[model samples]
Target: SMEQVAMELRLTELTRLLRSVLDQLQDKDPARIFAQPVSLKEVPDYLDHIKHPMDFATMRKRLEAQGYKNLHEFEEDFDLIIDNCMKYNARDTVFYRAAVRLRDQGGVVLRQARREVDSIG
Candidate 1:
């Protein structure tokens, strides 16, 4: 029961964030030009949609178009999002926590990989 309630709040946070990013996308961005915008209700993939709503091919193209060609370059603006979330009183919850984990682990893991490569060489 607690988990279910927590999940619901997390979902709400994601829908809110997705809606915010959608607003940021605006119209006529080449990556999203052909794609229709989604509302909180229309977001696909359910909860995990926070990870990404774009399809794989489209996402790849968007990354290339935005010059985020490397996986390391692909990023969510963690400080901005987290600060916005805090301002909106949505911090310390599951969704925000997960976002923090991703923002953190991305840099940490990449550095680890780089170190491994350097040590091997």
Candidate 2:
């Protein structure tokens, strides 16, 4: 019974950590640019510039479906959002600056998550 309880607690902690990371990222995007998938109609060349696209809605879906096997896997998708924006937008644009800020905030959020998860284990 103790083993079963421990496993359940670990899963709960992991889920909470993942959700917290996602929520922080979503909140950081004040422009809501990263809230959903980039529209090809709006930016026809987006696909050409970004090999892999990521967004908060997609990440939310993945999290709901248990698509992430670990924290690292979740982080990969999170980083992709920032990386794609930086790569596609010009260096002088607001989008680029937002991505830079998101990346910085994301690092802190993720590190805090790792620490919280480690303490639980």
Candidate 3:
């Protein structure tokens, strides 16, 4: 009896959350246009601003200069930024592909299409 009650309560809570989410979605209007989030191809530009662009010896040195100790830390930040760029880029790419597919399949109008982007958190 306790297990069955818990199961029912869980299902009820899930349904409530789902309906709330649906209600919010229903009220939200899609942005009239697509906004491109950050994309990855800016590494070369970033390098160009450095003092020793060829060496990448931290022309960005003074900003967070901690000698050699911070190299790994800097690398980690750069890696994370690139990761976000890649994730968003992949999402946008998929949206574009799906839009193309919709055009092919539905021509002028595709109903019930959702363009939600996945969040990393």
Candidate 4:
């Protein structure tokens, strides 16, 4: 019984995570998104600054070498960063959102979607 409960919880989280990734792929460049949680420090400091110094070539190389070929592959391979964020007891810092966009002087901004959890849940 407990095992079934755990299985259902995982299925729910995975489905939500997949949907989140697909939503992100719609706006932000797919190449920049990672399949799994990244080192927070590794993420470029986007605090009211200029362009991002993203090492696309290096990141791509790593992912490919690790056998990840496409975005869908990543979706199946990695869990949502949100799940790990909550496990580390970082709901306050990490927060919850539908989209995680990297903003810049152009179209991109620190703009984010809503989170009913932090809002009223």
TM-scores of the candidates in the order shown: 0.31, 0.86, 0.25, 0.25
Error of 4 at 66 (Å): 6.9
Quick one: best lDDT, which candidate? 2
Poorest 10 consecutive residues by lDDT, candidate 2: 7-16
Give the clashing residue pairs of candidate 2, or none.
none
Residue 75 local lDDT, model 3: 33
TM-score: model 1 vs. ground truth: 0.31
For candidate 4, lDDT tens digit of each residue in 43-101? 44432332222222333344434443333454333233323323333334423222233
Q: Which of the numbered candidates is closest to the native, going by highest TM-score? A: 2
Question: What is candidate 4's local distance difference test score?
Answer: 0.36
Q: Could you tell me the lDDT of residue 1 within candidate 2?
A: 100
RMSD in Å for model 4: 13.5
lDDT of each: 0.40, 0.85, 0.32, 0.36
- Model 2 regions more than 4 Å off: 1-9
By TM-score, is 1 or 3 better?
1
Worst 10 residues of 4 by lDDT: 102-111
What are the RMSD figures for all models against the true structure? 18.7, 2.4, 18.6, 13.5
lDDT of 2: 0.85
Estimate, for each residue in 13-116, the C-alpha lDDT of model 3 and write its tens digit.
44443333333332221331112322227554543333222112221332223222222333343333334333333545753444334234332221221111
Q: Can you write out model 2's per-residue Cα lDDT over 1-121, one digit (the tens) per residue?
A: 9998877666766777798888987788888888889999998988888999999999999987766757889989998999999988899999999999888877888898888767865
Q: Could you arrange the candidates by lDDT from highest to lowest?
A: 2, 1, 4, 3
Higher-lDDT candidate among 2 and 3? Answer: 2
What lDDT, from 0 to 1, does candidate 1 have?
0.40
